Structure 1
Amino acid sequence: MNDFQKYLSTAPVLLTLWMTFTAGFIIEVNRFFPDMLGLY
């Protein structure tokens, strides 16, 4: 477990997870609040 957590703490892995999360939240925002070119 400890060792696996270290692998999951490696730079490449963390970047992918973080970017996936970031991408996801951006996509989700556009799904519910779509087509915005300004704050209204």
Structure 2
Amino acid sequence: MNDFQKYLSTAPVLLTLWMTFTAGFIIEVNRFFPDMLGLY
């Protein structure tokens, strides 16, 4: 477990997870609040 957590703490892995999360939240925002070119 400890060792696996270290692998999951490696730079490449963390970047992918973080970017996936970031991408996801951006996509989700556009799904519910779509087509915005300004704050209204």
How many percent of aligned residue pairs carry the same amino acid?
100
List, as ranges, runs of 4+ consecutive aligned residues in structure 1 with deviation greater than 6 Å: none
* Number of residue pairs the alignment of both structures matches: 40
Q: CA deviation at 1:13?
A: 0.0
Unaligned 5+ runs, structure 1: none
Q: CA deviation at 1:4?
A: 0.0
Match of 1:31 in 2: 31
TM-score by length of structure 2 reads 1.00
User: For the residues of structure 2 that align with 1:6 and 1:16, how far apart are their CA atoms?
Assistant: 15
Unaligned 5+ runs, structure 2: none
TM-score by length of structure 1 reads 1.00
RMSD of the alignment, in Å? 0.0
